[PDB]
């Protein structure tokens, strides 16, 4: 049972990581990769309160607006498809909620993880990569084959980012199982 103070800290940390990373889909030499997708999966795993999700979605949107208006980041990725990010975040939340159902924290538990992880990321990847492909307007003549190319391009790096964070969150949990 966390005190209201400890919760505030957690919240800020989330928002912060978003603020810092949301501008890079994958790791630079000078930059950390967007932590948003692992964050929503992790809220599925851990957090019961439901308001927390639509609250962080708020923050995601705001952080993006600022970064593009004031922070001078491309508005390339912003389009009518933008809003498909939301079900992508819910799919990541639900997928964490799933993993939690049958956990065991065993080696087969890590094998169970690697599967869910693949599955939710894929789903978000369709919604974001595919939604942006077909519905942004940036692509003159989108087709299913060009969608597959895209998917093959982005799915893997963007699963790596996810992996790095979720694994690092598992590494940080055994530090709590041993305290
Ligand atoms: C690059 C990129 C960025 C860059 C900025 C864009 C830029 N152009 O500089 C960065 C890293 C800054 C970025 C930021 C964001 N992104 Co972004 N971004 C991408 C990415 C990786 C590519 C966009 C793209 O389509 N490329 C341009 C196209 C035309 O290239 P391509 O067809 O794939 O490749 C062609 C070229 O390589 C060309 N070619 C090859 N060699 C050469 C050489 C030369 C010289 C030339 C001219 C051409 C050329 O040929 C290829 C044709 O097949 C996509 C990934 C994706 N599609 O899933 C996301 C994506 C478009 N962005 C997305 C989003 C949402 C964002 C953010 C708004 C929020 C976020 N973090 O999720 C932020 C921006 C706000 C913020 N900072 O907080 C989402 C959009 C989702 C949606 N539903 O609309 C996508 C789909 C990623 C996702 N979440 O899966 N983005």
mmCIF file of C-alpha atoms and ligand atoms in Angstrom:
data_model
loop_
_atom_site.group_PDB
_atom_site.id
_atom_site.type_symbol
_atom_site.label_atom_id
_atom_site.label_comp_id
_atom_site.label_asym_id
_atom_site.label_seq_id
_atom_site.Cartn_x
_atom_site.Cartn_y
_atom_site.Cartn_z
ATOM 1 C CA UNK A 1 0.000 0.000 0.000
ATOM 2 C CA UNK A 2 1.799 3.080 -1.356
ATOM 3 C CA UNK A 3 1.391 6.471 0.345
ATOM 4 C CA UNK A 4 -0.038 9.277 -1.849
ATOM 5 C CA UNK A 5 3.453 10.746 -1.858
ATOM 6 C CA UNK A 6 5.035 7.543 -3.241
ATOM 7 C CA UNK A 7 2.335 7.380 -5.932
ATOM 8 C CA UNK A 8 2.991 10.979 -7.025
ATOM 9 C CA UNK A 9 6.660 10.038 -7.475
ATOM 10 C CA UNK A 10 5.727 7.049 -9.633
ATOM 11 C CA UNK A 11 3.331 9.107 -11.748
ATOM 12 C CA UNK A 12 5.988 11.841 -12.369
ATOM 13 C CA UNK A 13 8.521 9.159 -13.308
ATOM 14 C CA UNK A 14 6.131 7.722 -15.939
ATOM 15 C CA UNK A 15 5.250 11.156 -17.363
ATOM 16 C CA UNK A 16 8.918 12.085 -17.304
ATOM 17 C CA UNK A 17 10.026 9.001 -19.197
ATOM 18 C CA UNK A 18 7.319 9.798 -21.665
ATOM 19 C CA UNK A 19 8.430 13.447 -21.969
ATOM 20 C CA UNK A 20 12.077 12.316 -22.650
ATOM 21 C CA UNK A 21 11.548 9.280 -24.831
ATOM 22 C CA UNK A 22 8.367 10.039 -26.851
ATOM 23 C CA UNK A 23 10.469 11.703 -29.539
ATOM 24 C CA UNK A 24 12.414 8.590 -30.585
ATOM 25 C CA UNK A 25 10.810 5.362 -31.767
ATOM 26 C CA UNK A 26 14.121 3.658 -31.123
ATOM 27 C CA UNK A 27 17.379 4.186 -29.329
ATOM 28 C CA UNK A 28 19.794 6.857 -30.588
ATOM 29 C CA UNK A 29 23.391 7.149 -29.312
ATOM 30 C CA UNK A 30 22.164 10.358 -27.641
ATOM 31 C CA UNK A 31 18.556 9.311 -26.958
ATOM 32 C CA UNK A 32 16.437 6.775 -25.124
ATOM 33 C CA UNK A 33 13.603 5.082 -27.117
ATOM 34 C CA UNK A 34 9.932 5.874 -26.551
ATOM 35 C CA UNK A 35 8.998 4.111 -23.272
ATOM 36 C CA UNK A 36 5.239 4.577 -23.839
ATOM 37 C CA UNK A 37 4.331 1.100 -25.188
ATOM 38 C CA UNK A 38 6.145 -0.823 -22.344
ATOM 39 C CA UNK A 39 4.610 1.641 -19.883
ATOM 40 C CA UNK A 40 1.061 0.778 -20.920
ATOM 41 C CA UNK A 41 1.768 -3.004 -20.885
ATOM 42 C CA UNK A 42 3.320 -2.575 -17.439
ATOM 43 C CA UNK A 43 0.286 -0.705 -16.142
ATOM 44 C CA UNK A 44 -1.705 -3.772 -17.266
ATOM 45 C CA UNK A 45 0.580 -6.026 -15.264
ATOM 46 C CA UNK A 46 0.652 -3.959 -12.060
ATOM 47 C CA UNK A 47 -1.884 -1.247 -11.588
ATOM 48 C CA UNK A 48 -5.510 -1.947 -10.661
ATOM 49 C CA UNK A 49 -6.811 1.629 -10.905
ATOM 50 C CA UNK A 50 -8.393 2.127 -14.250
ATOM 51 C CA UNK A 51 -8.249 5.935 -14.419
ATOM 52 C CA UNK A 52 -4.498 5.762 -14.697
ATOM 53 C CA UNK A 53 -4.613 4.667 -18.379
ATOM 54 C CA UNK A 54 -6.825 7.469 -19.809
ATOM 55 C CA UNK A 55 -4.813 9.853 -17.627
ATOM 56 C CA UNK A 56 -1.536 8.826 -19.236
ATOM 57 C CA UNK A 57 -3.124 8.965 -22.676
ATOM 58 C CA UNK A 58 -3.943 12.569 -21.944
ATOM 59 C CA UNK A 59 -0.249 13.139 -21.100
ATOM 60 C CA UNK A 60 0.970 11.349 -24.244
ATOM 61 C CA UNK A 61 -1.158 13.674 -26.398
ATOM 62 C CA UNK A 62 -0.131 16.825 -24.619
ATOM 63 C CA UNK A 63 3.587 15.834 -24.649
ATOM 64 C CA UNK A 64 3.354 15.265 -28.421
ATOM 65 C CA UNK A 65 1.548 18.637 -29.080
ATOM 66 C CA UNK A 66 4.225 20.527 -27.189
ATOM 67 C CA UNK A 67 7.089 18.586 -28.714
ATOM 68 C CA UNK A 68 5.834 19.369 -32.180
ATOM 69 C CA UNK A 69 4.739 22.991 -31.627
ATOM 70 C CA UNK A 70 7.458 24.175 -29.179
ATOM 71 C CA UNK A 71 10.093 21.360 -29.245
ATOM 72 C CA UNK A 72 10.542 21.482 -32.993
ATOM 73 C CA UNK A 73 9.988 17.794 -33.807
ATOM 74 C CA UNK A 74 8.642 16.846 -37.183
ATOM 75 C CA UNK A 75 4.877 16.896 -37.501
ATOM 76 C CA UNK A 76 5.359 14.105 -40.073
ATOM 77 C CA UNK A 77 3.933 11.366 -37.884
ATOM 78 C CA UNK A 78 0.904 13.533 -36.993
ATOM 79 C CA UNK A 79 -2.096 12.879 -39.349
ATOM 80 C CA UNK A 80 -5.787 11.830 -39.079
ATOM 81 C CA UNK A 81 -4.490 8.300 -38.193
ATOM 82 C CA UNK A 82 -2.909 9.719 -35.056
ATOM 83 C CA UNK A 83 -5.865 8.614 -32.890
ATOM 84 C CA UNK A 84 -5.323 4.963 -33.609
ATOM 85 C CA UNK A 85 -2.534 5.238 -31.010
ATOM 86 C CA UNK A 86 -5.306 4.923 -28.417
ATOM 87 C CA UNK A 87 -6.542 1.345 -29.118
ATOM 88 C CA UNK A 88 -2.839 0.532 -29.573
ATOM 89 C CA UNK A 89 -2.323 1.651 -25.979
ATOM 90 C CA UNK A 90 -5.376 -0.283 -24.798
ATOM 91 C CA UNK A 91 -4.146 -3.424 -26.559
ATOM 92 C CA UNK A 92 -0.872 -3.003 -24.713
ATOM 93 C CA UNK A 93 -2.723 -2.474 -21.424
ATOM 94 C CA UNK A 94 -4.969 -5.517 -21.979
ATOM 95 C CA UNK A 95 -1.997 -7.675 -22.937
ATOM 96 C CA UNK A 96 -0.318 -6.831 -19.606
ATOM 97 C CA UNK A 97 -3.549 -7.555 -17.752
ATOM 98 C CA UNK A 98 -3.528 -10.975 -19.516
ATOM 99 C CA UNK A 99 0.091 -11.846 -18.636
ATOM 100 C CA UNK A 100 -0.846 -11.101 -15.002
ATOM 101 C CA UNK A 101 -3.722 -13.640 -14.990
ATOM 102 C CA UNK A 102 -1.319 -16.581 -15.274
ATOM 103 C CA UNK A 103 2.073 -15.385 -14.011
ATOM 104 C CA UNK A 104 3.988 -18.041 -11.912
ATOM 105 C CA UNK A 105 7.184 -15.912 -12.334
ATOM 106 C CA UNK A 106 8.880 -19.198 -13.483
ATOM 107 C CA UNK A 107 11.214 -19.708 -16.471
ATOM 108 C CA UNK A 108 8.090 -20.895 -18.332
ATOM 109 C CA UNK A 109 6.615 -17.614 -16.987
ATOM 110 C CA UNK A 110 9.309 -15.774 -18.981
ATOM 111 C CA UNK A 111 8.417 -18.047 -21.905
ATOM 112 C CA UNK A 112 4.754 -17.100 -21.336
ATOM 113 C CA UNK A 113 5.892 -13.480 -21.293
ATOM 114 C CA UNK A 114 7.874 -13.657 -24.560
ATOM 115 C CA UNK A 115 4.655 -14.896 -26.223
ATOM 116 C CA UNK A 116 2.246 -12.232 -24.903
ATOM 117 C CA UNK A 117 4.915 -9.638 -25.623
ATOM 118 C CA UNK A 118 5.080 -10.754 -29.224
ATOM 119 C CA UNK A 119 1.338 -10.807 -29.532
ATOM 120 C CA UNK A 120 0.461 -7.362 -28.086
ATOM 121 C CA UNK A 121 3.275 -5.595 -29.826
ATOM 122 C CA UNK A 122 2.136 -7.111 -33.115
ATOM 123 C CA UNK A 123 -1.413 -5.848 -32.514
ATOM 124 C CA UNK A 124 -0.241 -2.294 -31.606
ATOM 125 C CA UNK A 125 2.103 -2.550 -34.639
ATOM 126 C CA UNK A 126 -0.873 -3.222 -36.965
ATOM 127 C CA UNK A 127 -2.957 -0.397 -35.513
ATOM 128 C CA UNK A 128 -0.108 2.171 -35.564
ATOM 129 C CA UNK A 129 2.031 1.036 -38.564
ATOM 130 C CA UNK A 130 -0.979 -0.026 -40.623
ATOM 131 C CA UNK A 131 -3.283 2.793 -39.466
ATOM 132 C CA UNK A 132 -0.614 5.348 -40.308
ATOM 133 C CA UNK A 133 0.051 3.574 -43.638
ATOM 134 C CA UNK A 134 -3.600 3.508 -44.842
ATOM 135 C CA UNK A 135 -5.134 6.500 -43.090
ATOM 136 C CA UNK A 136 -2.507 9.218 -42.618
ATOM 137 C CA UNK A 137 -2.652 10.434 -46.189
ATOM 138 C CA UNK A 138 1.155 10.491 -46.453
ATOM 139 C CA UNK A 139 1.162 7.401 -48.723
ATOM 140 C CA UNK A 140 -0.258 7.827 -52.243
ATOM 141 C CA UNK A 141 -1.241 4.272 -53.020
ATOM 142 C CA UNK A 142 -1.060 1.951 -49.944
ATOM 143 C CA UNK A 143 -1.458 -1.803 -50.512
ATOM 144 C CA UNK A 144 -1.339 -4.925 -48.331
ATOM 145 C CA UNK A 145 2.136 -5.774 -49.607
ATOM 146 C CA UNK A 146 3.521 -2.337 -48.765
ATOM 147 C CA UNK A 147 1.863 -2.787 -45.374
ATOM 148 C CA UNK A 148 3.762 -6.007 -44.878
ATOM 149 C CA UNK A 149 7.046 -4.364 -45.880
ATOM 150 C CA UNK A 150 6.456 -1.535 -43.373
ATOM 151 C CA UNK A 151 5.560 -4.108 -40.675
ATOM 152 C CA UNK A 152 8.691 -6.067 -41.357
ATOM 153 C CA UNK A 153 10.694 -2.847 -41.111
ATOM 154 C CA UNK A 154 9.339 -1.422 -37.873
ATOM 155 C CA UNK A 155 7.892 -4.369 -35.875
ATOM 156 C CA UNK A 156 11.350 -5.742 -34.860
ATOM 157 C CA UNK A 157 13.128 -2.516 -33.688
ATOM 158 C CA UNK A 158 9.941 -1.394 -31.936
ATOM 159 C CA UNK A 159 9.683 -4.810 -30.210
ATOM 160 C CA UNK A 160 13.276 -4.386 -29.060
ATOM 161 C CA UNK A 161 12.495 -1.082 -27.391
ATOM 162 C CA UNK A 162 9.554 -2.777 -25.714
ATOM 163 C CA UNK A 163 11.795 -5.767 -24.626
ATOM 164 C CA UNK A 164 14.490 -3.506 -23.159
ATOM 165 C CA UNK A 165 11.942 -1.762 -20.963
ATOM 166 C CA UNK A 166 9.845 -4.769 -19.942
ATOM 167 C CA UNK A 167 12.965 -6.794 -19.232
ATOM 168 C CA UNK A 168 14.441 -3.961 -17.247
ATOM 169 C CA UNK A 169 11.151 -3.818 -15.288
ATOM 170 C CA UNK A 170 11.540 -7.567 -14.582
ATOM 171 C CA UNK A 171 15.167 -7.039 -13.555
ATOM 172 C CA UNK A 172 13.962 -4.309 -11.165
ATOM 173 C CA UNK A 173 11.291 -6.607 -9.697
ATOM 174 C CA UNK A 174 13.772 -9.280 -8.519
ATOM 175 C CA UNK A 175 15.552 -6.366 -6.761
ATOM 176 C CA UNK A 176 12.277 -6.024 -4.831
ATOM 177 C CA UNK A 177 11.792 -9.771 -4.371
ATOM 178 C CA UNK A 178 15.229 -9.505 -2.703
ATOM 179 C CA UNK A 179 14.586 -6.558 -0.314
HETATM 180 C C1 LIG B 1 10.802 8.521 -38.600
HETATM 181 C C2 LIG B 1 9.637 8.634 -37.667
HETATM 182 C C3 LIG B 1 9.583 9.620 -36.724
HETATM 183 C C4 LIG B 1 10.661 10.709 -36.481
HETATM 184 C C5 LIG B 1 10.148 12.017 -37.072
HETATM 185 C C6 LIG B 1 9.635 11.826 -38.492
HETATM 186 C C7 LIG B 1 10.669 12.228 -39.521
HETATM 187 N N1 LIG B 1 10.336 12.022 -40.801
HETATM 188 O O1 LIG B 1 11.737 12.750 -39.169
HETATM 189 C C8 LIG B 1 10.565 10.760 -34.979
HETATM 190 C C9 LIG B 1 11.524 9.768 -34.301
HETATM 191 C C10 LIG B 1 10.949 12.190 -34.598
HETATM 192 C C11 LIG B 1 9.101 10.440 -34.710
HETATM 193 C C12 LIG B 1 8.314 10.925 -33.646
HETATM 194 C C13 LIG B 1 6.987 10.581 -33.368
HETATM 195 N N2 LIG B 1 6.257 9.556 -33.997
HETATM 196 CO CO1 LIG B 1 6.986 8.643 -35.530
HETATM 197 N N3 LIG B 1 7.564 7.562 -36.967
HETATM 198 C C14 LIG B 1 8.629 7.559 -37.718
HETATM 199 C C15 LIG B 1 8.707 6.329 -38.586
HETATM 200 C C16 LIG B 1 9.883 5.478 -38.058
HETATM 201 C C17 LIG B 1 8.908 6.562 -40.097
HETATM 202 C C18 LIG B 1 7.814 7.478 -40.614
HETATM 203 C C19 LIG B 1 7.718 7.095 -42.050
HETATM 204 O O2 LIG B 1 6.691 6.570 -42.470
HETATM 205 N N4 LIG B 1 8.810 7.330 -42.794
HETATM 206 C C20 LIG B 1 8.810 8.117 -44.012
HETATM 207 C C21 LIG B 1 8.340 7.100 -45.114
HETATM 208 C C22 LIG B 1 7.905 7.707 -46.438
HETATM 209 O O3 LIG B 1 9.454 6.187 -45.254
HETATM 210 P P1 LIG B 1 9.270 4.651 -45.478
HETATM 211 O O4 LIG B 1 8.080 4.536 -46.537
HETATM 212 O O5 LIG B 1 9.030 3.747 -44.318
HETATM 213 O O6 LIG B 1 10.682 4.557 -46.245
HETATM 214 C C23 LIG B 1 10.963 5.197 -47.493
HETATM 215 C C24 LIG B 1 12.258 6.001 -47.479
HETATM 216 O O7 LIG B 1 13.208 5.255 -46.746
HETATM 217 C C25 LIG B 1 12.619 6.014 -48.955
HETATM 218 N N5 LIG B 1 14.045 5.997 -49.239
HETATM 219 C C26 LIG B 1 14.991 5.048 -48.975
HETATM 220 N N6 LIG B 1 16.214 5.513 -48.965
HETATM 221 C C27 LIG B 1 16.068 6.869 -49.233
HETATM 222 C C28 LIG B 1 17.015 7.886 -49.274
HETATM 223 C C29 LIG B 1 16.612 9.206 -49.490
HETATM 224 C C30 LIG B 1 17.624 10.305 -49.377
HETATM 225 C C31 LIG B 1 15.241 9.497 -49.728
HETATM 226 C C32 LIG B 1 14.798 10.855 -50.175
HETATM 227 C C33 LIG B 1 14.297 8.478 -49.663
HETATM 228 C C34 LIG B 1 14.724 7.182 -49.411
HETATM 229 O O8 LIG B 1 12.063 4.862 -49.534
HETATM 230 C C35 LIG B 1 11.199 4.186 -48.606
HETATM 231 C C36 LIG B 1 9.973 3.703 -49.348
HETATM 232 O O9 LIG B 1 9.760 2.336 -49.095
HETATM 233 C C37 LIG B 1 7.296 5.703 -38.343
HETATM 234 C C38 LIG B 1 7.244 4.156 -38.274
HETATM 235 C C39 LIG B 1 6.007 3.445 -38.776
HETATM 236 N N7 LIG B 1 5.563 3.746 -40.029
HETATM 237 O O10 LIG B 1 5.469 2.589 -38.058
HETATM 238 C C40 LIG B 1 6.704 6.381 -37.099
HETATM 239 C C41 LIG B 1 5.223 6.833 -36.978
HETATM 240 C C42 LIG B 1 4.824 7.381 -38.334
HETATM 241 N N8 LIG B 1 5.282 7.924 -35.960
HETATM 242 C C43 LIG B 1 4.258 7.826 -35.117
HETATM 243 C C44 LIG B 1 4.030 8.694 -33.942
HETATM 244 C C45 LIG B 1 2.640 8.627 -33.386
HETATM 245 C C46 LIG B 1 4.976 9.558 -33.443
HETATM 246 C C47 LIG B 1 4.802 10.632 -32.347
HETATM 247 C C48 LIG B 1 3.697 11.633 -32.769
HETATM 248 C C49 LIG B 1 4.319 10.053 -30.964
HETATM 249 C C50 LIG B 1 5.030 8.795 -30.628
HETATM 250 N N9 LIG B 1 6.258 8.864 -30.156
HETATM 251 O O11 LIG B 1 4.447 7.725 -30.811
HETATM 252 C C51 LIG B 1 6.241 11.271 -32.245
HETATM 253 C C52 LIG B 1 6.341 12.792 -32.466
HETATM 254 C C53 LIG B 1 5.904 13.655 -31.281
HETATM 255 C C54 LIG B 1 6.885 13.672 -30.125
HETATM 256 N N10 LIG B 1 8.172 13.899 -30.431
HETATM 257 O O12 LIG B 1 6.492 13.526 -28.951
HETATM 258 C C55 LIG B 1 3.321 6.677 -35.398
HETATM 259 C C56 LIG B 1 1.998 7.093 -36.053
HETATM 260 C C57 LIG B 1 0.804 6.346 -35.483
HETATM 261 C C58 LIG B 1 -0.523 6.767 -36.080
HETATM 262 N N11 LIG B 1 -1.584 6.034 -35.729
HETATM 263 O O13 LIG B 1 -0.592 7.734 -36.875
HETATM 264 C C59 LIG B 1 4.231 5.785 -36.308
HETATM 265 C C60 LIG B 1 3.458 4.840 -37.221
HETATM 266 C C61 LIG B 1 4.984 4.864 -35.352
HETATM 267 C C62 LIG B 1 4.180 3.863 -34.414
HETATM 268 N N12 LIG B 1 3.738 4.317 -33.237
HETATM 269 O O14 LIG B 1 4.102 2.690 -34.760
HETATM 270 N N13 LIG B 1 8.569 9.715 -35.716
#
